[PDB]
Design an enzyme around this catalytic site. Sequence first.
Site, PDB file in Angstrom:
ATOM      1  N   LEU A 139      51.802  75.271  52.393  1.00  0.00           N
ATOM      2  CA  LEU A 139      53.037  75.444  52.222  1.00  0.00           C
ATOM      3  C   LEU A 139      53.643  76.048  51.019  1.00  0.00           C
ATOM      4  O   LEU A 139      54.519  76.824  51.015  1.00  0.00           O
ATOM      5  CB  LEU A 139      53.850  73.973  52.273  1.00  0.00           C
ATOM      6  CG  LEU A 139      53.709  73.207  53.349  1.00  0.00           C
ATOM      7  CD1 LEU A 139      54.502  71.975  53.535  1.00  0.00           C
ATOM      8  CD2 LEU A 139      54.201  74.246  54.933  1.00  0.00           C
ATOM      9  N   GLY A 145      51.759  76.555  43.149  1.00  0.00           N
ATOM     10  CA  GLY A 145      52.344  76.801  42.117  1.00  0.00           C
ATOM     11  C   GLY A 145      51.481  76.682  41.004  1.00  0.00           C
ATOM     12  O   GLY A 145      50.224  76.343  41.103  1.00  0.00           O
ATOM     13  N   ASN A 146      51.539  76.965  39.641  1.00  0.00           N
ATOM     14  CA  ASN A 146      50.689  76.701  38.445  1.00  0.00           C
ATOM     15  C   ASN A 146      50.060  75.496  38.385  1.00  0.00           C
ATOM     16  O   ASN A 146      48.873  75.228  38.097  1.00  0.00           O
ATOM     17  CB  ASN A 146      51.455  77.066  37.202  1.00  0.00           C
ATOM     18  CG  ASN A 146      51.539  78.694  37.042  1.00  0.00           C
ATOM     19  OD1 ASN A 146      50.573  79.315  37.288  1.00  0.00           O
ATOM     20  ND2 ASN A 146      52.591  79.063  36.518  1.00  0.00           N
ATOM     21  N   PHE A 147      50.698  74.429  38.816  1.00  0.00           N
ATOM     22  CA  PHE A 147      50.500  73.038  38.408  1.00  0.00           C
ATOM     23  C   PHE A 147      50.627  72.090  39.740  1.00  0.00           C
ATOM     24  O   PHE A 147      50.203  70.893  39.788  1.00  0.00           O
ATOM     25  CB  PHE A 147      51.265  72.261  37.352  1.00  0.00           C
ATOM     26  CG  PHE A 147      51.061  73.031  36.029  1.00  0.00           C
ATOM     27  CD1 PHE A 147      49.753  73.104  35.362  1.00  0.00           C
ATOM     28  CD2 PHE A 147      51.943  73.749  35.601  1.00  0.00           C
ATOM     29  CE1 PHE A 147      49.383  73.786  34.327  1.00  0.00           C
ATOM     30  CE2 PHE A 147      51.944  74.214  34.005  1.00  0.00           C
ATOM     31  CZ  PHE A 147      50.587  74.120  33.549  1.00  0.00           C
ATOM     32  N   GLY A 148      50.893  72.816  40.797  1.00  0.00           N
ATOM     33  CA  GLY A 148      51.208  71.880  42.101  1.00  0.00           C
ATOM     34  C   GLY A 148      51.069  72.641  43.156  1.00  0.00           C
ATOM     35  O   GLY A 148      50.836  73.891  43.224  1.00  0.00           O
ATOM     36  N   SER A 149      50.363  72.161  44.413  1.00  0.00           N
ATOM     37  CA  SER A 149      50.239  72.832  45.639  1.00  0.00           C
ATOM     38  C   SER A 149      50.752  71.638  46.612  1.00  0.00           C
ATOM     39  O   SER A 149      50.433  70.444  46.473  1.00  0.00           O
ATOM     40  CB  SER A 149      48.841  72.862  45.991  1.00  0.00           C
ATOM     41  OG  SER A 149      48.493  73.748  47.117  1.00  0.00           O
ATOM     42  N   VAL A 150      51.176  72.270  47.761  1.00  0.00           N
ATOM     43  CA  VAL A 150      51.476  71.266  48.910  1.00  0.00           C
ATOM     44  C   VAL A 150      51.264  71.964  50.298  1.00  0.00           C
ATOM     45  O   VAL A 150      51.166  73.156  50.394  1.00  0.00           O
ATOM     46  CB  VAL A 150      53.241  71.396  49.013  1.00  0.00           C
ATOM     47  CG1 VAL A 150      53.723  70.258  50.131  1.00  0.00           C
ATOM     48  CG2 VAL A 150      53.979  71.036  47.815  1.00  0.00           C
ATOM     49  N   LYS A 172      51.455  66.638  48.499  1.00  0.00           N
ATOM     50  CA  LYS A 172      51.363  67.427  47.272  1.00  0.00           C
ATOM     51  C   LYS A 172      50.117  66.988  46.500  1.00  0.00           C
ATOM     52  O   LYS A 172      49.898  65.757  46.208  1.00  0.00           O
ATOM     53  CB  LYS A 172      52.618  67.049  46.501  1.00  0.00           C
ATOM     54  CG  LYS A 172      52.439  67.565  45.104  1.00  0.00           C
ATOM     55  CD  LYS A 172      53.877  67.564  44.377  1.00  0.00           C
ATOM     56  CE  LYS A 172      54.020  68.137  42.725  1.00  0.00           C
ATOM     57  NZ  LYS A 172      55.175  67.970  42.100  1.00  0.00           N
ATOM     58  N   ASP A 207      65.604  69.787  37.069  1.00  0.00           N
ATOM     59  CA  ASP A 207      65.270  71.026  37.625  1.00  0.00           C
ATOM     60  C   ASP A 207      66.196  71.306  38.867  1.00  0.00           C
ATOM     61  O   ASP A 207      65.547  71.721  39.909  1.00  0.00           O
ATOM     62  CB  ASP A 207      63.677  70.969  37.723  1.00  0.00           C
ATOM     63  CG  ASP A 207      63.030  72.417  38.061  1.00  0.00           C
ATOM     64  OD1 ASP A 207      63.672  73.325  37.819  1.00  0.00           O
ATOM     65  OD2 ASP A 207      62.018  72.717  38.481  1.00  0.00           O
TER      66      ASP A 207
END
Length: 288
Positions: free
Chosen positions: A16, A19-24, A43, A137
């Site tokens: 989905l 990012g730099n510090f997360g993935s889903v 996540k 955020d």
Amino acid sequence: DPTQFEERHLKFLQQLGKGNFGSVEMCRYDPLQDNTGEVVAVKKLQHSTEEHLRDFEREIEILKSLQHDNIVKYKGVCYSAGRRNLKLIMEYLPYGSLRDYLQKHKERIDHIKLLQYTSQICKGMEYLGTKRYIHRDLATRNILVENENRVKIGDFGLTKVLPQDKEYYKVKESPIFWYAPESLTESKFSVASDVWSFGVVLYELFTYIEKSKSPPAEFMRMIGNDKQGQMIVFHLIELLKNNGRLPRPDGCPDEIYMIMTECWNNNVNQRPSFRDLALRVDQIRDNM
Ligand SMILES: Nc1nc(Nc2ccc(S(N)(=O)=O)cc2)nn1C(=O)c1c(F)cccc1F
């Protein structure tokens, strides 16, 4: 509960977003191995450290502590890699971020829909405030679309809990174009700086994510697109402190722009509350 989502039954469906510090990922939890089960979003960290794992635990606790119609639902934790790692299990919202949805599905978006989404965002933020959580955020990229009639706040990765004795949290460790001036100049985040960011969210909605109208694109046009590095922040601070603001989007009712401008008050205590804003927006809708 470490046996609720066992890694061996969490089946990959789709990537989905990374990012730099997360993935889903979209997965199906299939405890019977019959190629059925519930569809969930999973996540995981990217580029993890012990400090990021600790923040990730705080994020999981925050999400689990929330039960509201306009907040992404917590489902659980997977203790993967033989229980030597953590993944967060949450509900899967089919239509993705509100930013992408406004771009992709403009055929079914009008002002009535925009104000419905605005209302739901305010209510979710009222709820968050009762836990004394500061989102830090808020942005249409972090609001998710369940269907054309329901949006939910997500991404609590930056969310902080107020200290017991204080009405702000001072970050000692940045989406600067959504930041309140006192967040830029003193690292102070509060419900009122969340209300500032919500004004930027309302701006985004009424720009319909047109090319060149995003807050970064507009602020940079105002500052000077050549500026690089810290000079950008310097100019952003100077601009905001002396009443420089995002413009009224084309087609935006004056009344709605006035809501934006009241959220964008340099005076922290004169910004409206999320309860004020919900009531004002729902009264505009009901008076329509
Ligand atoms: N819980 C959740 N559901 C979704 N739905 C989603 C996400 C992406 C798409 S896409 N690749 O544009 O087509 C479509 C539907 N996202 N989601 C998240 O927590 C989430 C997030 F917050 C930020 C980034 C990625 C995520 F995955």
